[PDB]
Design a protein around this nucleic acid. Structure first.
Ligand SMILES: [K+]
Ligand SMILES: [K+]
Ligand SMILES: [K+]
Ligand SMILES: [K+]
Ligand SMILES: [K+]
Ligand SMILES: [K+]
Ligand SMILES: [K+]
Ligand SMILES: [K+]
Ligand SMILES: [Mg+2]
Ligand SMILES: [Mg+2]
Ligand SMILES: [Mg+2]
Ligand SMILES: [Mg+2]
Ligand SMILES: [Mg+2]
Ligand SMILES: [Mg+2]
Ligand SMILES: [Mg+2]
Ligand SMILES: [Mg+2]
Ligand SMILES: [Mg+2]
Lengths: 80, 177, 82, 114
RNA sequence: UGGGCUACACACGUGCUACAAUGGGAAGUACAACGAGUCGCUAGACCGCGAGGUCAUGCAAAUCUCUUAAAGCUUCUCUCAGUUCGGAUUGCAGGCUGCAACUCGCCUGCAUGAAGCCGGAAUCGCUAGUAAUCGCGGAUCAGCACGCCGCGGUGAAUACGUUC
RNA sequence: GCGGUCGCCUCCUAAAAGGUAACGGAGGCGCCCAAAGGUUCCCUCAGAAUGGUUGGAAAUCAUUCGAAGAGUGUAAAGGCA
C-alpha cells in the first residue's frame, strides 16, 4: 500500500450493545473508548446496537406482530 | 481477521465436505472485492464525484481509482475520459475486514432491510450486491453526506458455480432472501 | 361515528338473505337496493349486486372489504374527464 | 438523535420532540410526564441520561418509518379494494366528502387555467 | 326503493380562516345585552383527555336553566423561525342525532401539518357609539351555518373642498 | 460559348513487374503535434453474454467468451496485435 495517500486505518473491536457479542476488525473511524482484547492488546471500541446476532433474521425469529386483520378488528370492536 | 479465521476453520472444511473436493486447493475462496460507485453527476458538478470519492475512501480504507468514461456519449453529455465513477480493490486482510463489517454493521443499518438478493450472480460463482444508499457505514456520519448515493460491491471468488459461491457467501454470513 | 353501543348496522332483509345462503356450496348473487347495510365477516366470499341508482353492480366481498358500507363499493356517478 | 431524526437543539424539549414524525405536542407532554423531564429545559441542556429515558419512551411509541408504512398500507388497501375512498385517493380528490366544484386545491394541486 | 340536486380540466360573486410578537401558548381575574325553554331548558353530582355519558334537580319561567360571554386586565413562556405562526388535507379511534351518516351530517382525541411572508390591473364599506374588532342569542331545525336576523363589549381615522 | 478543370496525395480504370489516356469512376491536401517526437520499461483491442443504486439500448464495475471484426491526428491504399 502506497504511503500517505490512504485514509488512516486502525484495528478496532466491536461489541453488540444489545447482546454483547464481540468481533475484531479494522476501520477508518476511531472511538475514544478503548477496551482490552485477548493476546493482551488494547483497541478502540465501537459499540453497536444492532449486529448479525442481534438482527432477527440471523437468529430466525421475528419481533414484529404483522398487524391485525379487519375481520378480527371488527369482531373485537363490536364484541362479536 | 475474524472472517479469515471463520473461513479457514469452519467454512473451508464444510465446503470440502459438501462439494467433495479431492484436494483443499479446490476450495473456493473470496479472491477479491471490487466496490464500484458510478457517478454520472460529475458531469453536472465534479464535486459530487469528489465527495463520493471521499465517502468511498472512508468506507474502504483505500484511496479509490477514479475510472474515466472510455467513450464520449452525447446522450449523457459525457465526453471521453470524463472522470465519472470510482472503484476500490480489496484483497487479503482488508478484503476480509471490510466483508465482515458489511455483514455485521453496514447491512443492518439499511432501511427496512429484508436481506440481500439471491439471484444477483453472474453465473460463474461471482456475486454483486447493490447498496442503494450510504449512511449505513459507520464512517459516513449521517451528516457529511450532502447528496446521498449508492454503490455496487462485486465479490469475485474462485468458485466455478453460483452454487459454491452461494454456499461460501452464506457461510461467511449473507442475509439471502 | 356509529355509536359502539348501537353496534354495526345492516338491513334485516339483507342479513336474512345472507343467512339463508350461508350453508351454500356455491354462492349466488344477492341483489340489494340497500346501500346502508354494513359488510360483515359472514358477508365475506359473497357476490352482491348493489343498486347504484340505475343498475345493480356486482362486487365480490372479501375479509379486506368488511367493515365498510356496501354503498361505498358501488360508485353512483361517473366522471370520465373533460 | 432520538428516533433517527436530529431534533432542534435550542428549542424547548417539548417542541423539539414534536419535530419527530408521529409525535405531536400532546404526545410530547405525555412522554415528558413519564420520564419526569421538565418541559422548559432545552434539549441541548438535557443530560445524556434524560435523553436515554426519552429514547426509551419514543421507542415505546410508534413514529417515523413505522408510522408512515402503516398509513401507506391503509391507503394502498383502500385503492386495491377499489373503494370510493380508494378512487378518491388514486385521482387526488377530497376523500372526506367535500364539494369539488370549487376549492379542493389541496388535493387537486395547483390550478390549471385550461 | 335507490340515486341526484353535494359532480369537477376550469371562470366569477359573497364570506370564514390566516399569513403572526398590537402575536401564539399556559395560569389567574372582571364586566353585558337581545332572546329560548315541556318531553323542552337542564342544575348538582359521578365517569370520560374530549366530544359526551349516568343518576338527578328546578322551571311553562323578572323565580330554574341555556348563561361565570369573548375581546379585556395581571403574571409566566415562546423570540422573528414557513416557526410553539397557519390549520388545509390525510390515517386511526370515538361521540352524538336519526330506521339509516357510502354517495352525504356535525362534533371529539391522537397523528399528519398543505398553501399562505399582506396580495397586479382593478374594486368595495363606512362620517361616531359609526368603521374596525369581540363575543352572545334566535328563526329554520331529529341532527347540521363561515349564511341570515338581532344583541351587547371595546372603540378609532378623516371631511381642506366640489375640479373630477 | 455556358458549366467544369488547371499544382500535390490515395484508390479503381491499369490487361498479376514498372508505366499507361479520356470533360472516365471515387475521395483527399495547401495541415496538425512541444507530444501526437526520441528512448527504456510496461500493456493489449472492438463487441457479445451474465450479474449488478442512481442508470435508462447505451455512463462506471466483475467473470467469461472473444485474432482483430478495434486503434493507428487527418482521404484512400498498403502495413502494423
Ligand atoms: K361533494
Ligand atoms: K368561488
Ligand atoms: K358569477
Ligand atoms: K362563508
Ligand atoms: K403573551
Ligand atoms: K351523510
Ligand atoms: K339547530
Ligand atoms: K514517451
Ligand atoms: Mg411531529
Ligand atoms: Mg358536505
Ligand atoms: Mg343547490
Ligand atoms: Mg414572518
Ligand atoms: Mg351619511
Ligand atoms: Mg356591535
Ligand atoms: Mg501494374
Ligand atoms: Mg501487365
Ligand atoms: Mg502513433
Amino acid at each position: 500500500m502506497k504511503q500517505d495517500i490512504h485514509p488512516n486505518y486502525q484495528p478496532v473491536v466491536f461489541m453488540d450493545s444489545t447482546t454483547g457479542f464481540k468481533f475484531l476488525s479494522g476501520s477508518t473511524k476511531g472511538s475514544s473508548e478503548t477496551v482490552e482484547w485477548e493476546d493482551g492488546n488494547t483497541y478502540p471500541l465501537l459499540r453497536v446496537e444492532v449486529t448479525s446476532d442481534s438482527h432477527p433474521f440471523y437468529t430466525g425469529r421475528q419481533k414484529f406482530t404483522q398487524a391485525d386483520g379487519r375481520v378480527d378488528r371488527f369482531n373485537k370492536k363490536y364484541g362479536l | 481477521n475474524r472472517l479469515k479465521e471463520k473461513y479457514i476453520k469452519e467454512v473451508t472444511p464444510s465446503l470440502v465436505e459438501k462439494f467433495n473436493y479431492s484436494s483443499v486447493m479446490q476450495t473456493p475462496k473470496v479472491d477479491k472485492i471490487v466496490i464500484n460507485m458510478g457517478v454520472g453527476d460529475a458531469v453536472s458538478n465534479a464535486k459530487n464525484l469528489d465527495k463520493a470519492v471521499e465517502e468511498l475512501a472512508l468506507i474502504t480504507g483505500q484511496k479509490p481509482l477514479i475510472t474515466k468514461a472510455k467513450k464520449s456519449i452525447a446522450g449523457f453529455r459525457l465526453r471521453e475520459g470524463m472522470p465519472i465513477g470510482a472503484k476500490v480493490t480489496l484483497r487479503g486482510e482488508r478484503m476480509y475486514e471490510f466483508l465482515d463489517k458489511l455483514v455485521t454493521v453496514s447491512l443492518p443499518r439499511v432501511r427496512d432491510f429484508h436481506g440481500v438478493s439471491k439471484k444477483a450472480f453472474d453465473g460463474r460463482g461471482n456475486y454483486t450486491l447493490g447498496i442503494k444508499e450510504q449512511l449505513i457505514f459507520p464512517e459516513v456520519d449521517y451528516d457529511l453526506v450532502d447528496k446521498v448515493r449508492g454503490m455496487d460491491i462485486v465479490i469475485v471468488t474462485t468458485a466455478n458455480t453460483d452454487e459454491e459461491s452461494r454456499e461460501l457467501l452464506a457461510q461467511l454470513g449473507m442475509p439471502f432472501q | 361515528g356509529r355509536s359502539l353501543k348501537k353496534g354495526p348496522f345492516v338491513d334485516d332483509h339483507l342479513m336474512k338473505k345472507v343467512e339463508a345462503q350461508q350453508g351454500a356450496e356455491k354462492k349466488k348473487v344477492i341483489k340489494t337496493w340497500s346501500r346502508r347495510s354494513t359488510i360483515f365477516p359472514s358477508f365475506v366470499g359473497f357476490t352482491i349486486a348493489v343498486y347504484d341508482g340505475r343498475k345493480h353492480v356486482p362486487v365480490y366481498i372479501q375479509e379486506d372489504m368488511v367493515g365498510h358500507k356496501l354503498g361505498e363499493f358501488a360508485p353512483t356517478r361517473t366522471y370520465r374527464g373533460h | 438523535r432520538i428516533a433517527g431524526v436530529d431534533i432542534p437543539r435550542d428549542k424547548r424539549v417539548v417542541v423539539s420532540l414534536t419535530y419527530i414524525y408521529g409525535i405531536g405536542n400532546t404526545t410530547a407532554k405525555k412522554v415528558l410526564a413519564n420520564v419526569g423531564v421538565s418541559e422548559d429545559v432545552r434539549v441541548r441542556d438535557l443530560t445524556n441520561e434524560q435523553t436515554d429515558a426519552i429514547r426509551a419512551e419514543i421507542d415505546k411509541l410508534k413514529v417515523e418509518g413505522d408510522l408512515r408504512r402503516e398509513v401507506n398500507l391503509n391507503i394502498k388497501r383502500l385503492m386495491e379494494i377499489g373503494s370510493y375512498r380508494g378512487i378518491r385517493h388514486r385521482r387526488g380528490l377530497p376523500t372526506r366528502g367535500q364539494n369539488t366544484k370549487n376549492n379542493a386545491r389541496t388535493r387537486k394541486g395547483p390550478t390549471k387555467t385550461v
